[PDB]
């Protein structure tokens, strides 16, 4: 339900709405069938995966996503619903997202995780 990272203290953290059915969580390098909505800190909707024909999907912590997703998606159960609050050290700070994000802006993603190790 909160914010901070339990090692660096800045990184991420996540607001719970609907907790899971299958109590298990994903392991490092496992395949997860996610779907996300996402906003910048000014309340601007830059991205939502369902709109582009289908759901989202990655392999936990493989370069593929952001480090804020490897921390908060490692803590996500089968069927769960929450909202991620992320900081640029774990996200777009040392890079910037291609269409409009600069190297120092706060970030937001509402994630629904369907299933992973199953």
Curated annotation (Swiss-Prot):
Phosphorylation by CK2 results in loss of HSP90 binding activity. Coiled coil: none annotated. It is found in: Cytoplasm, Cytosol; Mitochondrion; Nucleus; Cytoplasm, Cytoskeleton. Disulfide bonds: none annotated. Residues 29-117 form the PPIase FKBP-type domain. Homodimer. Interacts with GLMN; rapamycin and FK506 abolish the interaction with GLMN in a dose dependent manner. Associates with HSP90AA1 and HSP70 in steroid hormone receptor complexes. Also interacts with peroxisomal phytanoyl-CoA alpha-hydroxylase (PHYH). Interacts with NR3C1 and dynein. Interacts with HSF1 in the HSP90 complex. Associates with tubulin. Interacts with MAPT/TAU. Interacts (via TPR domain) with S100A1, S100A2 and S100A6; the interaction is Ca(2+) dependent. Interaction with S100A1 and S100A2 (but not with S100A6) leads to inhibition of FKBP4-HSP90 interaction. Immunophilin protein with PPIase and co-chaperone activities. Component of steroid receptors heterocomplexes through interaction with heat-shock protein 90 (HSP90). May play a role in the intracellular trafficking of heterooligomeric forms of steroid hormone receptors between cytoplasm and nuclear compartments. The isomerase activity controls neuronal growth cones via regulation of TRPC1 channel opening. Also acts as a regulator of microtubule dynamics by inhibiting MAPT/TAU ability to promote microtubule assembly. May have a protective role against oxidative stress in mitochondria. The C-terminal region (AA 375-458) is required to prevent tubulin polymerization. The PPIase activity is mainly due to the first PPIase FKBP-type domain (1-138 AA). This is Peptidyl-prolyl cis-trans isomerase FKBP4. It comes from Oryctolagus cuniculus. The lineage of its organism: Eukaryota, Metazoa, Chordata, Craniata, Vertebrata. The chain holds residues 22 to 139 of 458 of the full protein.
């Amino acid at each position: 339900g909160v914010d901070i990272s339990p090692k660096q203290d800045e990184g991420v953290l996540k607001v719970i709405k609907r907790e899971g059915t299958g109590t298990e969580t994903p392991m490092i390098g496992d395949r997860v069938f996610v779907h996300y909505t996402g906003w910048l800190l000014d309340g601007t909707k830059f991205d939502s995966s369902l709109d582009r024909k289908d759901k989202f999907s990655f392999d936990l912590g493989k370069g593929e996503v952001i480090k804020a997703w490897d921390i908060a998606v490692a803590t996500m159960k089968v069927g769960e619903l929450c909202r991620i609050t992320c900081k640029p050290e774990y996200a777009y700070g040392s890079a910037g997202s291609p269409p409009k994000i600069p190297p120092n802006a706060t970030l937001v993603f509402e994630v629904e995780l369907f299933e992973f190790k199953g």
